[PDB]
Amino acid sequence: GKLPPGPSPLPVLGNLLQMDRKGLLRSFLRLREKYGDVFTVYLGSRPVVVLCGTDAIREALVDQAEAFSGRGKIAVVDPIFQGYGVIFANGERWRALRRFSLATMRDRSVEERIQEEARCLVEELRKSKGALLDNTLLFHSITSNIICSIVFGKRFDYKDPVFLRLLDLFFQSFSLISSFSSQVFELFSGFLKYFPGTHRQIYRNLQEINTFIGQSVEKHRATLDPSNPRDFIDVYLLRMEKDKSDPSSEFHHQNLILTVLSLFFAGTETTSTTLRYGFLLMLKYPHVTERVQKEIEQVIGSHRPPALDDRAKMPYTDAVIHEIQRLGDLIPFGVPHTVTKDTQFRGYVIPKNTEVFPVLSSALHDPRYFETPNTFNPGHFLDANGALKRNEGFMPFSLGKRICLGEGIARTELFLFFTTILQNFSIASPVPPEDIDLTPSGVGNVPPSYQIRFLARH
């Protein structure tokens, strides 16, 4: 057995010279062209196995789900997470935190917090009276507020300057994490960590968030009612007490800080940018947005708030959302995995702990599953009867055991925010549809910034 084929590497520099300067995603797509769907690339001196196309990614993450369930490190944030918290934990630590986190958030429901946030957002947008605005901040705020409501048992006002201060420096961290400079850090951190760069700024920002999280933990502990836990932090503190006699237990303070940080880290920016991309497509394609508001009117009407049960009756809107996520492609080369043991895969052997990237973009644009993969097309998700249809290339949340933990919540946000906004508002912008440019990144693709008006309807 051996590793999947790929370009021969240099000793310190790995496959530096066979990389493309546009970044990792582009580097991977060009190599795929030369080497096939499964290949090995050296990021500095680390071998990394790259998976492209729906079928190879499913063969790994679904057909050998356990083998492929390891988590690989992200150099720019590892000095913060250091293998703690739900995202970056491995083995028994991960299993315990993932089990605990799923059970905890799945119990005012999440749906209800979302409808309340959407109600707050609409009330805020109305105050605009159709003024031009950049919706970036509002979309960061609504999605952060869903996580806040789950973890801290509260939401924050849109104009709260302390919320906004922390929000700003938190979201600044995402742009930085996505930059070319950080991508270079992913390859050569062993050297570059000794010099100034984005990694110090990412570190400082996230540590400052950890400080605030730590203060809210103290405050929760001081006011705790063990009979009536308020939120994720309360429930976790009760688990710490329950496990206090087990010194092997994963429920300690560091896992708590870093699990809370993980939920904001994974659950805010992807959701927010999906919404922002969505509204950019809805300005580019008024006929779609018109059909979505027609379906809203038929199913929901103009008086009551959308509810999640509405989605089953709204295949067209559901299909529009699927297509926004697909074309959005917000995590285009996945989040690194590792194999948890020596692994046979398509006739190659992948040694234990080798890093693997599932290149979700190449599934999202797979021409086997999407007739017009580069064109916005809700028909990709609709059958001949206009009913929603599952699509095997649709894996924006990934697949298998590491599948997005927040998938259910994120989809509920997407549905209720898109539909609650479009129920109450129509949209316009200074840029005619024809000149709207959808090209982003890209460790995470970021849409252009744009101006929009929300025009209150009857």
Ligand code: HEM
């Ligand atoms: C449109 C919005 C979202 C998208 C497309 C998305 C996508 C992803 C992806 C691609 C992964 C990597 C899975 C893998 O390792 O292969 C992931 C992991 C994760 N996601 Fe999401 N996400 C979104 C929103 C959220 C939200 C709202 C939450 C929490 C409320 C969240 C929580 C997490 C967590 C905690 C992990 C680590 C899972 C693990 O390692 O077991 N995500 N998500």
Ligand SMILES: OC[C@H]1O[C@H](O[C@H]2[C@H](O)[C@@H](O)[C@H](OCCCCCC3CCCCC3)O[C@@H]2CO)[C@H](O)[C@@H](O)[C@@H]1O
């Ligand atoms: O002088 C400071 C005053 O502000 C306080 O507000 C608290 C709030 O009660 C408290 O809920 C808040 O917690 C901050 C949690 C950190 C949130 C970080 C996330 C925010 C959303 C985006 C992702 C990151 O911190 C504030 C710190 O001040 C209290 O309102 C006052 O009692 C206090 O006197």
Ligand SMILES: OC[C@H]1O[C@H](O[C@H]2[C@H](O)[C@@H](O)[C@H](OCCCCCC3CCCCC3)O[C@@H]2CO)[C@H](O)[C@@H](O)[C@@H]1O
């Ligand atoms: O990590 C060290 C921290 O120690 C204290 O906080 C601890 C507390 O010392 C520690 O008591 C607490 O664990 C208790 C959590 C739930 C208490 C269980 C109770 C159940 C009812 C019967 C009494 C016990 O965890 C906190 C997490 O920080 C300090 O308050 C913090 O400032 C300090 O950061």
Ligand SMILES: Fc1ccc([C@@H]2CCNC[C@H]2COc2ccc3c(c2)OCO3)cc1
């Ligand atoms: F589990 C999760 C981990 C990281 C996220 C990030 C959250 C913010 N927006 C970008 C998401 C992906 O970021 C990555 C992707 C691959 C990488 C990378 C960083 O550096 C080199 O290889 C989301 C969920």
